[PDB]
């Protein structure tokens, strides 16, 4: 079975750089390979097959050159739409094998997260569970520490976070924070906060409310 | 203008049975190669295989992990390719797609598991008392996936729909959230619509300061 194994695993380049990522066959593959773009959320998608061919209505900045066993993908120009994970394929025998894929991630100057708190929804309470959500809106670079208070108290392991892929326009990353919290607990007490720790700003922000009011 | 559409994705009992279907159009069906590749959640695609053409007495190739289990076919009259799979694992859980090898359908979700299925609640996110954050908390689903759009699709710009998060519970939640001028917040509607088509849910959220 063909290894088809691509190099570098992950990429963090600047917008207008050029970009390369190599794919190396364990055999000779003649030109019998393909390069995919996969954008978060969607199919992949063709961009170059016979390993220097472009598919029909492909970016001219893309291209593709190798034979036998030496693959290489560029972006001339790196964009902004260009977040994605590429993948090559092998396809002289059968089983076709795909590399692991090479994840390309942009560069850009520092932006501050806008930090939202929301309380927990009347209608929620009724089931007996209470959900705190922090908003992390619109921030570079990704690190970023959410610590959740309740009355001073630190909590720990009862919080989730999720990440949005880089944005295909700005670059920029947001992130979702939710404290699960016993309605019981939630009515135990009084000041619920999250405070956020980045790169981009000064000192910590918080944002709190008070349940009461 | 080509178009590929699969069907029969869903939650399925390990050792049990699904056909998928890839309707194709704006191509010559007959003279291309249809094939399946899969993408484990958070992984790489993996090949599942290959039919060829009439001219090619419909051979057909698997990868390992599937062959004997997995039977693609074709049905050049419909322009539709089929992914038949039997003994299912919780390891073929993934999305699978379809390609005539130029162009790949949007793909289909595949959970191989016992666990039941669970329609979502939908909360608020309520915006604060000039630019304003709102949402929708969709909690305590599954299977995955659900979709959420804002005002039936007309708000598209300042929305993240974030990827969902697997609880301690087994459970899903996802959270949706738009950033809109502050001063939209009294005269402008914000409904998120969530679809959660394995349990038949679909719910519209208006979200609105609170009172």
């Known amino acids: 079975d063909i290894q088809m194994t691509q190099s570098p695993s992950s990429l963090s380049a600047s917008v207008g750089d050029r970009v390369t990522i190599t794919c190396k066959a364990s055999?000779?593959?003649?030109?019998?390979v393909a390069w995919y773009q996969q954008k978060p959320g969607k199919a992949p998608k063709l961009l170059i097959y016979?390993?220097?061919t472009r598919h029909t209505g492909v970016p001219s900045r893309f291209s593709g050159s190798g034979s036998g066993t030496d693959f290489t993908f560029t972006i001339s120009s790196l964009q902004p739409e260009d977040i994605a994970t590429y993948y090559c394929?092998?396809?002289?025998?059968?089983?076709?094998?795909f590399g692991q894929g090479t994840k390309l991630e942009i560069k850009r100057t520092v932006a501050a997260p806008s930090v939202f708190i929301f309380p927990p929804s009347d209608e929620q309470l009724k089931s007996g569970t209470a959900s705190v959500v922090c908003l992390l809106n619109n921030f570079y670079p990704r690190e970023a520490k959410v610590q959740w208070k309740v009355d001073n108290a630190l909590q720990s392991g009862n919080s989730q976070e999720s990440v949005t892929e880089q944005d295909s326009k700005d670059s920029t990353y947001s992130l979702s924070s939710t404290l699960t919290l016993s309605k019981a607990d939630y009515e135990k007490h009084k000041v619920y906060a999250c405070e956020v720790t980045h790169q981009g700003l000064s000192s910590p922000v918080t944002k709190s409310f008070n349940r009461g009011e | 203008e080509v178009q590929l559409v699969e069907s029969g994705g869903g939650l399925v009992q390990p050792g049990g049975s699904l056909k998928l279907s890839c309707a194709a159009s704006?191509?010559?069906?007959?003279?291309?190669?249809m094939n399946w590749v899969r993408q484990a959640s958070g992984k790489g695609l993996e090949w599942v295989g290959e039919?060829?053409?009439?001219?090619?007495?419909?051979?057909?190739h698997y990868a390992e992990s599937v062959k004997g289990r997995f039977t693609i076919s074709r049905d050049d009259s419909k322009n539709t390719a089929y992914l038949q799979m039997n003994s299912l694992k919780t390891e073929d859980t993934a999305v699978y797609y379809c390609?005539?090898?130029?162009?790949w359908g949007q793909g289909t979700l595949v959970t191989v598991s016992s666990a039941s299925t669970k329609g979502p609640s939908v909360f608020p996110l309520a915006p604060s008392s000039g630019t304003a954050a709102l949402g929708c908390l969709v909690k305590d689903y599954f299977p995955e996936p659900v979709t959420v759009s804002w005002n039936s699709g007309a708000l598209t710009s300042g929305v993240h729909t974030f990827p969902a998060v697997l609880q301690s519970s087994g459970l899903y939640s996802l959270s949706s959230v738009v950033t809109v001028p502050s001063s939209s917040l009294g005269t402008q509607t914000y409904i998120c619509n969530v679809n959660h088509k394995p349990s038949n849910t679909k719910v519209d959220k208006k979200v609105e300061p609170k009172s």
């Open positions: 016979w390993a220097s």
């Open positions: 055999q000779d593959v003649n030109t019998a």
């Open positions: 390609s005539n090898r130029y162009y």
């Open positions: 394929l092998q396809y002289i025998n059968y089983p076709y094998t």
């Open positions: 039919i060829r053409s009439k001219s090619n007495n419909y051979a057909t």
């Open positions: 704006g191509f010559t069906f007959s003279n291309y190669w």
